[PDB]
Structure formats: structure tokens, C-alpha cells
């Protein structure tokens with residue numbers, strides 16, 4: 001199981017609820033995180049165990065409230081972060097530039113939802129972050145952006 005560190009999840013973390021769409025926070029939120037388009041952005045999570053596979057899908061719907069809202073026109077998932085295996089528990093953090101996705105409406109002021117998709121052997125698990133894309137963002141605290149390492153797993 002895992003928590004989003006930055007950008008922050010839609011609502012209160014409930015481990016049991018991670019099996020549901022957006023961790024059972026189905027409704028979009030209005031307290032969105034400003035997320036930079038200048039290439040300084042990242043996604044940071046914390047996993048309780050490893051190994052696991054993680055990726056993220058994205059919705060450019062302001063009201064993203066179902067799986068459909070994360071699919072492209074041909075009905076495939078809009079992948080924001082490609083799936084990979086992670087071999088250490090604790091913090092995992094990937095740079096994320098939304099400008100690098102070929103998705104319409106990625107621009108200053110655009111609303112989106114990033115859904116992290118996690119598989120670590122105890123189910124398919126989900127958490128969502130509601131963001132607003134901005135050209136630049138003031139005072140981005142990058143201190144959560146590290147990869148933990150464990151000599152003995």
C-alpha cells in the first residue's frame with residue numbers, strides 16, 4: 001500500500017479503500033495543487049512494501065469521477081507515467097512534465113487528475129491528485145523527492 005506525498009491526494013488516506021477508483025474519493029476536489037509545466041514537476045509516493053509495479057494515468061476532465069475520464073479516444077488509458085518495477089520500499093519519486101504528453105488542453109490553468117496505479121501483490125491500488133497546470137510554480141518544495149534504499153530487503 002502507498003500514500004501520495006506530492007502532489008497531495010484528493011482526501012484522507014484509507015488503506016482499505018485503495019482498491020477502489022481514486023482510493024474511494026470518487027468526487028473531484030476544488031482544492032487543487034498548482035503543478036508546473038516548466039519541467040520542474042515530479043510525483044512522489046511512499047510505499048510500505050516492495051517490490052511493486054507503479055505507473056500513473058491522467059484525466060484532463062475537470063470533473064474526473066470515473067475510469068472513462070482517464071481514457072483516450074481509442075479507449076486506452078492515458079498513461080502519464082509508464083509502469084515500472086520499484087525494488088525499494090519508502091519514498092519513490094519520478095520527474096513528471098505534462099508538456100511531454102500528446103494530450104489536448106495541457107496549458108496554463110488546465111485542470112487534471114493524476115491517478116497512481118500500484119500493484120505490490122496485495123491488490124490493484126489507487127490514489128488521485130487533483131491539479132491545476134501552471135506555466136511556473138512558486139517555491140516548489142522538492143524535499144519529498146527522493147528514492148529510499150534498503151541494503152537488506
Ligand SMILES: *[C@@H]1O[C@H](CO)[C@@H](O)[C@H](O)[C@H]1NC(C)=O
Pocket residue numbers: 007008009010011012029031032033
Ligand atoms: C483538499 O481538501 C480535503 C478535504 O478537506 C483534504 O482532505 C485534502 O487533503 C486536500 N487536498 C490537498 C491536496 O491538500
Ligand SMILES: *[C@@H]1O[C@H](CO)[C@@H](O)[C@H](O)[C@H]1NC(C)=O
Pocket residue numbers: 026027028
Ligand atoms: C460525491 O459523489 C456522489 C456519488 O457519486 C455524488 O452524488 C455527490 O454529489 C458527490 N459530491 C461532491 C461534493 O462532489
Ligand SMILES: *[C@@H]1O[C@H](CO)[C@@H](O)[C@H](O)[C@H]1NC(C)=O
Pocket residue numbers: 029030031032062109111132
Ligand atoms: C479548475 O478547478 C478550479 C478549482 O476547483 C475551478 O475553480 C476552475 O474553474 C476550474 N477550471 C475549469 C476550466 O474548469
Ligand SMILES: *[C@@H]1O[C@H](CO)[C@@H](O)[C@H](O)[C@H]1NC(C)=O
Pocket residue numbers: 072073074075076077078079
Ligand atoms: C490510447 O492509449 C494507448 C495506451 O493506453 C495508446 O497505445 C494509444 O496509442 C492511444 N490512442 C490514441 C488515440 O492516441
Ligand SMILES: *[C@@H]1O[C@H](CO)[C@@H](O)[C@H](O)[C@H]1NC(C)=O
Pocket residue numbers: 141143144
Ligand atoms: C519543505 O518541507 C520540509 C518538510 O518536508 C520542511 O522541512 C521545509 O521547511 C520545507 N522547505 C521550505 C523551503 O519551506
Ligand SMILES: *[C@@H]1O[C@H](CO)[C@@H](O)[C@H](O)[C@H]1NC(C)=O
Pocket residue numbers: 084092093094095145146147
Ligand atoms: C528514482 O529512481 C527512478 C528509477 O526507478 C528514477 O527515474 C528517478 O529519477 C529517481 N528519483 C530520484 C529522486 O532520484
Ligand SMILES: [Cu+2]
Pocket residue numbers: 001002048049120122
Ligand atoms: Cu500493500
